[PDB]
From a paper:
Heat Shock Protein 70s (HSP70s) are a family of molecular chaperones with diverse functions, including directly assisting in the correct folding of nascent polypeptides, preventing protein aggregation and aiding the translocation of newly folded proteins to their correct location in the cell. HSP70s interact with almost all newly synthesized, partially folded proteins and are able to recognize such a diverse range of proteins by interacting with short motifs of five amino acids, enriched with hydrophobic residues, which are found in practically all polypeptides. Heat Shock Protein 70s (HSP70s) are key molecular chaperones that are overexpressed in many cancers and often associated with metastasis and poor prognosis. A surface plasmon resonance (SPR) fragment screen designed to detect secondary binding sites in [name] led to the identification by X-ray crystallography of a cryptic binding site in the nucleotide-binding domain ([name]) of [name] adjacent to the ATP-binding site.
Seven fragments with similar SPR responses to wild-type HSC70-[name] and the S275W mutant were assessed by soaking into [name]-[name] crystals, and a single hit (1) was found to be bound to the protein. The structure of 1-[name]-[name] revealed the fragment bound in a new secondary binding site located adjacent to the ATP-binding site. This site has not been described before and is not present in the currently reported apo or nucleotide-bound crystal structures of [name] isoforms. The cryptic binding pocket results from movements of the C-terminal subdomain comprising residues D225–L305 relative to the N-terminal subdomains. In particular, the α-helix N256–S277 that lines the nucleotide-binding cleft moves closer to the N-terminal domain than in nucleotide-bound structures, and residues G339–N360 move further away from the helix N256–S277, forming the binding pocket for 1. The new pocket consists of an extended narrow tunnel with a mix of hydrophobic and hydrophilic amino acids, in contrast to the larger and more hydrophilic ATP-binding site. The lipophilic 4-phenylthiazole motif of 1 forms mainly hydrophobic interactions with the protein and extends into the canonical nucleotide-binding site, with one single direct hydrogen bond between the compound and the side chain of S340, and additional indirect interactions with G201, K271, S340, R342 and D366 mediated by three water molecules. The binding of 1 in the new secondary site necessitates that the α-helix N256-S277 moves out of position relative to the opposite face of the nucleotide-binding cleft and twists the section from K271–S277, displacing the key S275 residue from the orientation required for a productive interaction with a nucleotide. Thus, when 1 binds to [name], the ATP-binding site is disrupted, and we expected that the two binding events would not be possible at the same time.
Author numbering: 2 to 383
The structure:
């Protein structure tokens, strides 16, 4: 029997693994039934937890639960991005020769890990999710990275794959993987200008690619760091901080424990809106023992975040300028990230593109892994 290769979207907050088998891509769910797995690792006196198990115990173990390794990978410790991010993380980041390492307690001792070691643990979990589905060990993979990652970040991501025991067939960028998922590199002769609009993940990104005889050229990349998934969560947090003020007469904004528990509920409620018109928030003993039970409607979420959705258009206009292309020169518009599922986000982009239709047939939370899986099958078939 021949071994299939997997495609891995190694995400900032969630990772996704796919495998192409017999003409179709299967996005593989993990052992908790989740088609995406938190890019989290936690350490205890006896265990190293990865994915859902690590994320689900973050509230009581914040110093030894690592996340956001993608924000450190391939960077120098003195990078002002690293220094600003360190102020928000509850886990320790140390400087070892101008390279960051995360330091935690694990098995009764202090241990430090390079970002590519934390990402290799996430990769090992993705590998195991695929091996449980396929029933044999998986070692060939295509791993994706953002188009704006430099050579240091791409090489460090490849190193995480090597540490996880994977043969990294290729490192491809996330917008290229999305275009491959839709087969936009297989439309025959003639160039195709593709715009990839990625909203909902760790960072909002707009990229423009030109595909010519199967060859991809990145013409432009634009975005907004304050349009990541966390900024949508924080908008929901501020809204519920005001609701708790009106209902219980207390201001919880300066209580770290209360704000963190509310942020976890908000992030899950936000995602729950993909399958339901209304998501319930049930937080026991949120602040001073007061239970906070509420809900968020899709209608409210859309109005609350209207300005954030509108803030995505200026980066699209800037990417079109950098690429030296008119809106009418774009053949395909591709949606990536959970927020692109919202018909109001789709309407904003469709109207901006003068009525052009958008590609949304592949679940935007899965499109990057879907494309990485297709590319992995193509390289393994070769
Ligand atoms: N950021 C993120 O992951 N999410 C944002 C909030 N969600 C919403 N989905 C909708 C929605 C979905 C399908 C049909 C109509 C409406 C409305 S608000 C889910 C995705
Ligand atoms: Mg992503």
């Amino acid at each position: 029997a021949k071994a299939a290769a997997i495609g891995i979207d190694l995400g900032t907050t969630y990772s996704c693994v796919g495998v192409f088998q017999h003409g179709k891509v299967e996005i593989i769910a993990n052992d908790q039934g989740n088609r995406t797995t938190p890019s989290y690792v936690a350490f205890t006196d006896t265990e190293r937890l990865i994915g859902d198990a690590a994320k689900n115990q973050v509230a009581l173990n914040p110093q030894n639960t690592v996340f956001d390794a993608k924000r450190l990978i391939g960077r120098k410790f003195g990078d002002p991005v690293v220094q600003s991010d360190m102020k928000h993380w509850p886990f320790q980041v140390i400087n070892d020769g101008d390279k960051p390492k995360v330091q935690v307690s694990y098995k009764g001792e202090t241990k430090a890990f390079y970002p590519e070691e934390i990402s290799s643990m996430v990769l090992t979990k993705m590998k195991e999710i695929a091996e449980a589905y396929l029933g044999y060990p998986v070692t060939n993979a295509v791993i994706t990275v953002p188009a704006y990652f430099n050579d240091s970040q791409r090489q460090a991501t490849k190193d995480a794959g090597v540490i996880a025991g994977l043969n990294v067939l290729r490192i491809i960028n996330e917008p290229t993987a999305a275009a491959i998922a839709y087969g936009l590199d297989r439309t025959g002769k003639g160039e195709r200008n593709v715009l990839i609009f990625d909203l909902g993940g760790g960072t909002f990104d707009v990229s423009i690619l030109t595909i010519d005889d199967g060859i991809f050229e990145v013409k432009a990349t634009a975005g907004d760091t304050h349009l990541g998934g966390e900024d949508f969560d924080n908008r929901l947090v501020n809204h519920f901080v005001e609701e708790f003020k009106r209902k219980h007469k207390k201001d919880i904004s300066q209580n770290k424990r209360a704000v963190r528990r509310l942020r976890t509920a908000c992030e899950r409620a936000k995602r729950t809106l993909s399958s339901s018109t209304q998501a319930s928030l049930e937080i026991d003993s949120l602040f001073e023992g007061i239970d906070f039970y509420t809900s968020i409607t899709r209608a409210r979420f859309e109005e609350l975040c209207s300005d954030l959705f509108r803030s995505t258009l200026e980066p699209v206009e800037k990417a079109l300028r950098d690429a030296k292309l008119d809106k009418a020169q774009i053949h395909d518009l591709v949606l990536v990230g959970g927020s692109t599922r919202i018909p109001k986000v789709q309407k904003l982009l469709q109207d901006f593109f003068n009525g052009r239709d958008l590609n949304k047939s592949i679940n935007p939370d899965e499109a990057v892994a879907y494309g990485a899986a297709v590319q992995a099958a193509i390289l393994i078939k070769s």
